[PDB]
Amino acid sequence: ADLGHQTLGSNDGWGAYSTGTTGGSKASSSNVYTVSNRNQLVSALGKETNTTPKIIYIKGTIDMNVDDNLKPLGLNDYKDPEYDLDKYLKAYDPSTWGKKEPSGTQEEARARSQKNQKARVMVDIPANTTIVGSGTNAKVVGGNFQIKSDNVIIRNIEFQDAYDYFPQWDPTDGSSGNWNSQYDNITINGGTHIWIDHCTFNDGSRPDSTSPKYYGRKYQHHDGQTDASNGANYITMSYNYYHDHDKSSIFGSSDSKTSDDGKLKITLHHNRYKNIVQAAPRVRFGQVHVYNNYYEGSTSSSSYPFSYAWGIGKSSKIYAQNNVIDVPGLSAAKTISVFSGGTALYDSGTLLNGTQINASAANGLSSSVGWTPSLHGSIDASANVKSNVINQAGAGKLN
Ligand SMILES: O=C(O)[C@H]1O[C@H](O[C@@H]2[C@H](O)[C@@H](O)[C@@H](O[C@@H]3[C@H](O)[C@@H](O)[C@@H](O[C@@H]4[C@H](O)[C@@H](O)[C@@H](O[C@@H]5[C@H](O)[C@@H](O)[C@@H](O)O[C@@H]5C(=O)O)O[C@@H]4C(=O)O)O[C@@H]3C(=O)O)O[C@@H]2C(=O)O)[C@H](O)[C@@H](O)[C@H]1O
Ligand SMILES: [Ca+2]
Ligand SMILES: [Ca+2]
Numbered sequence: 243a244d245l246g247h248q249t250l251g252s253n254d255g256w257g258a259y260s261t262g263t264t265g266g267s268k269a270s271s272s273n274v275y276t277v278s279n280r281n282q283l284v285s286a287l288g289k290e291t292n293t294t295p296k297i298i299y300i301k302g303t304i305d306m307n308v309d310d311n312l313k314p315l316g317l318n319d320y321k322d323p324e325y326d327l328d329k330y331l332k333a334y335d336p337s338t339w340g341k342k343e344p345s346g347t348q349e350e351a352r353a354r355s356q357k358n359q360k361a362r363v364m365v366d367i368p369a370n371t372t373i374v375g376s377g378t379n380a381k382v383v384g385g386n387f388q389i390k391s392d393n394v395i396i397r398n399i400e401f402q403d404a405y406d407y408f409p410q411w412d413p414t415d416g417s418s419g420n421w422n423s424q425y426d427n428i429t430i431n432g433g434t435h436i437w438i439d440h441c442t443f444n445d446g447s448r449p450d451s452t453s454p455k456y457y458g459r460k461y462q463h464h465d466g467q468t469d470a471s472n473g474a475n476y477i478t479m480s481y482n483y484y485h486d487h488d489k490s491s492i493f494g495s496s497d498s499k500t501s502d503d504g505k506l507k508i509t510l511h512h513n514r515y516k517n518i519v520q521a522a523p524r525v526r527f528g529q530v531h532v533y534n535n536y537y538e539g540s541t542s543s544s545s546y547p548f549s550y551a552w553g554i555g556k557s558s559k560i561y562a563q564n565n566v567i568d569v570p571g572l573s574a575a576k577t578i579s580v581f582s583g584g585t586a587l588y589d590s591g592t593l594l595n596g597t598q599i600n601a602s603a604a605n606g607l608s609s610s611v612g613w614t615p616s617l618h619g620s621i622d623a624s625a626n627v628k629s630n631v632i633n634q635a636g637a638g639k640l641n
């Protein structure tokens with residue numbers, strides 16, 4: 243079968259659990275679409291009621307920051323009449339505003355501005371849907387696919403630059419505050435039975451190195467690449483190429499969302515993370531299988547310096563096998579970041595700069611995560627992971 247009609251293999255990660263991930267493979271003739279712009283994409287997707295099996299082939303580049311006539315939209319198109327960056331900056335400067343939460347005119351205007359862009363860039367993917375790139379050049383630019391539904395396949399697409407024109411200042415996000423933005427390339431919001439395979443995720447033509455610092459903090463226009471939240475469950479992400487981006491993959495959005503316990507069952511395999519700063523993945527609660535992934539970066543990079551690969555967040559249950567990390571000068575311990583409530587990590591076969599390490603032991607974590615993955619394909623020896631992943635991961639590698 244072609245990419246449009248293929249299903250997730252019955253053994254291929256958490257996505258294959260129970261009813262599995264078949265997407266729109268069973269689509270009838272009238273439910274197979276080819277789309278080349280935002281209008282056609284939105285029409286094909288329809289509403290949440292569009293639950294018939296459907297296949298959507300993306301042809302070429304789809305820019306999501308466009309109006310109903312496909313005219314490009316930018317900052318001044320989305321901006322609320324009362325919003326002004328100069329005045330926003332002046333209002334919430336720590337020097338005069340202190341560390342209290344931004345409120346009042348400019349913040350309210352910024353929030354309205356953000357909702358205006360959200361209306362264009364963010365689209366929900368309905369149940370029983372396969373979306374695949376045709377050829378080697380299928381792109382979604384500026385877009386944020388959200389999956390709240392069951393049974394969705396996304397393959398062979400380059401996702402670029404999910405860009406927020408209205409980053410929000412949070413003076414208490416970290417010791418010196420942070421700017422936060424809203425759009426991921428894909429957000430799995432309670433979504434279940436999902437396969438994301440042979441996609442590419444990057445920051446397009448607007449990497450973080452092109453954004454200024456305000457209040458000494460990067461004016462951050464990007465969110466995640468592939469996040470998962472709110473009881474998202476039974477997901478396989480494979481053969482994806484994540485590059486040139488800060489916060490990649492956050493699974494479990496809050497230490498307070500204890501309902502995520504027993505959920506966020508995700509398998510990550512054969513993914514490439516090049517010049518990714520952090521969260522690859524950052525996990526709270528979930529039984530996450532991480533195997534045969536390749537990580538490459540530099541702690542001294544001028545654009546996207548490596549911070550950590552795996553985030554051991556609250557009650558996380560990461561099971562890692564035969565992953566390869568290539569970051570010069572990095573210690574065994576610093577391959578991961580351990581957050582409060584994170585106490586356990588299973589990792590075997592971890593190669594750091596060509597040397598076998600034990601990331602869990604280096605961080606004093608328990609090696610018992612209370613599970614062993616049964617749903618996986620063949621496991622590559624660590625010695626072959628770099629070659630296999632570079633050769634195979636990302637969009638335009640099949641077609
Ligand atoms: O109305 C809607 O559109 C939605 O509302 C609900 O969702 C909210 C929110 O709107 C979503 O954007 C999302 O955001 C998550 C967190 O709430 C947010 O703080 C952020 O979090 C991550 C990370 O989890 C967090 O710890 C922190 O990271 C720190 C530090 O800030 C970093 O600089 C770095 O040093 O790492 C640290 C660390 O790892 O701990 O900030 C992170 C970040 O990305 O900046 O992003 C989260 C995310 O994007 O997943 O979910 C919220 C939620 O409550 O679910 C609603 O749930 C949704 O359904 C919509 O309706
Ligand atoms: Ca943050
Ligand atoms: Ca976020």
Ligand SMILES: [Ca+2]
Nearest residue numbers: 426465466469
């Ligand atoms: Ca996000």
